[PDB]
Design a binder for this molecule. Structure first.
Ligand SMILES: COC[C@H](C)NC(=O)C1=NN(C)C(=O)CC1
Lengths: 300, 237
């Protein structure tokens, strides 16, 4: 069980840790989050009480280092930092725990939600989407644009998701125009899976990361990428059976976790109706179709 | 974006452009089978590809053999259209290639865009104009070459005959669209108007009769009356 200590909490902020969140008051004696499960990536995220603009946060894996949070009054945000002095860190944490100044990662034993949302998400792949090689953790916020968005502007602050474009030479074989546009299997299986991602686990990892950035930061570009990766599978006639079954589980838990009230900003009517009711895979996503129909029947 | 009544003169500027109409590509007769079911029989069709500034018509004849053994023919016909238009563009010298292609039906946009990915600088545009190009098969010489074809074939025409020697391309386009609208609303009457007077003839190298300027004004007036009539006969007004 790992710990992310906080130096202090000088400004009032809502703090998220994965799918949980809690409010900290200005100058409240808060010194971090303990009992964080080992084995998963995690995200610790922030919304200031005085400017709900810019949700921001940090993806990290406690196996990769000892990380802590410290507010910067010049840049005006809570920053993640790495402590290289292991004994300093253990001594800081042990003292904060002794004084019970930490919140406990509040995992229910029955509850596999976070595993089910991050099953294929790896820190090493996050660090290639979010490029800042001097840190082991990755910063994301509400406003960051994707490489694809920039093509249609600071490249160092971009989300380098894999570009997917259904009307592109990459997607469409010369001489198979109609075939490749109406059945995207060659783009999915040969171009993306064999060529770019190498395997379906990496594809699902990026899909899951894009969803989580959409949900936790309201990142529009991330939302676009999530839907594009869903649509590419659903619009393929030939998809490995294990991938369709896993996709159904992935989407089921994403839809389950989404706030009931954000379905108008985080769900695209066209994509979901096409995927569940018109696409090649309209009959292959039973769990997702069932939860969508019972939770968001308006969208459909 | 889309072409409409507001940017109408753009059709006659010096940027090469083509209209593409696909409404006569896939053509069928519907009939009863011996068992009393219904079946279709395809007949030859054509892509109508027109430069509105010069009158040059690229008429690609679509022979019924292209449909043999194929499914979902109404969908295939849009992609076949786009394939043939792309092939035509590639066949033209660079300085003759269009800068814009305007499709008369919005369902042609994605097929044509996908087939023209190699030409990112050619704009593919819809239009809000309701153009009457479906009536092209009411022009006798065009219908004749389509029905007589035994194989895929491209035939080149000037749909304005020699009109541009005397009138502008705006006025020629307006005359063409009036003639075609009339033929579309009441083909028999329209053709009566055009051929009533046997002393006015169609030159071998032309599509329409050799009307004088004054005769065209009379013809054009008769076509407006017909369209208004039919609009009355239709709605009872
Ligand atoms: C076109 O980009 C901006 C466009 C108005 N949408 C947004 O800014 C939002 N998008 N999403 C997905 C959110 O969760 C917050 C609001």
């Amino acid at each position: 069980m790992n710990t992310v200590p906080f130096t202090s909490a000088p400004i009032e902020v809502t703090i998220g840790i994965d799918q949980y969140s809690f409010n900290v008051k200005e100058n409240q004696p808060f010194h971090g989050i303990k009992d964080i499960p080992i084995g998963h990536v995690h995200v610790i995220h922030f919304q200031h009480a005085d400017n709900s603009s810019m949700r921001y946060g940090y993806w990290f894996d406690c196996r990769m280092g000892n990380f802590y949070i410290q507010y910067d009054p010049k840049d005006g945000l809570y920053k993640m930092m790495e402590e290289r002095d292991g004994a300093k860190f253990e001594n800081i944490v042990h003292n904060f725990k002794e004084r019970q100044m930490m919140v406990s990662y509040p995992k229910i034993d029955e509850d596999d939600t976070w595993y089910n949302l991050t099953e294929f998400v790896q820190m090493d792949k996050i660090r290639k989407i979010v490029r800042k090689d001097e840190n082991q953790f990755s910063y994301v916020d509400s406003s960051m644009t994707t490489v694809q968005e920039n093509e249609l502007s600071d490249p160092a602050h971009s989300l380098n998701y894999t570009v997917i474009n259904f009307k592109s030479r990459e997607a469409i074989r010369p001489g198979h125009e109609m075939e490749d546009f109406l059945d995207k299997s060659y783009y999915l299986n040969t171009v993306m899976l064999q060529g770019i991602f190498k395997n379906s686990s990496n594809y699902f990892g990026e899909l899951q990361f894009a969803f989580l950035n959409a949900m936790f930061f309201g990142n529009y570009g991330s939302s676009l990428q999530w839907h594009a990766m869903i649509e590419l599978i659903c619009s393929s006639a030939t998809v490995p059976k294990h991938m369709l079954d896993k996709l159904d589980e992935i989407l089921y838990y994403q839809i389950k976790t989404l706030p009931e009230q954000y379905s108008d900003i985080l769900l695209n009517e066209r994509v979901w109706n096409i995927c569940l009711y018109s696409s090649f895979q309209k009959n292959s996503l039973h769990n997702t179709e069932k939860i969508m129909e019972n939770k968001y029947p308006e969208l459909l | 974006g889309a072409m409409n009544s507001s940017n109408y003169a753009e059709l006659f500027n010096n940027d090469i452009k083509l209209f593409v109409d696909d409404t006569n590509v896939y053509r069928v007769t519907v009939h009863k089978t011996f068992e009393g079911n219904v079946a279709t029989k395809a007949i030859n069709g054509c892509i109508f590809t027109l430069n509105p500034k010069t009158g040059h018509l690229f008429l690609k004849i679509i022979h019924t053999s292209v449909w043999a053994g194929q499914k979902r023919l109404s969908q295939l016909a849009k992609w076949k259209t786009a394939e043939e238009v792309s092939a035509l563009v590639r066949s033209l010298p660079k300085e003759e290639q269009p800068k814009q292609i305007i499709v008369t039906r919005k369902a042609m946009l994605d097929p044509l865009e996908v087939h023209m990915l190699d030409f990112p600088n050619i704009a593919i545009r819809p239009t809000e104009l309701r153009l009457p190009f479906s009536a092209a098969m009411s022009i006798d010489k065009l219908s004749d070459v389509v029905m007589k074809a035994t194989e895929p074939q491209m035939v080149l025409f000037n749909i304005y005959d020699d009109w541009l020697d005397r009138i502008s391309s705006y006025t020629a386009f307006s005359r063409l669209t009036l003639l075609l609208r009339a033929l579309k609303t009441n083909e028999e009457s329209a053709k009566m108007i055009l051929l009533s007077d046997p002393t006015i003839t169609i030159k071998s190298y032309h599509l329409w009769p050799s009307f004088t300027d004054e005769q065209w004004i009379t013809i054009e007036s008769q076509m407006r009356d017909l369209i208004l009539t039919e609009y009355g006969r239709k709605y009872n007004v």
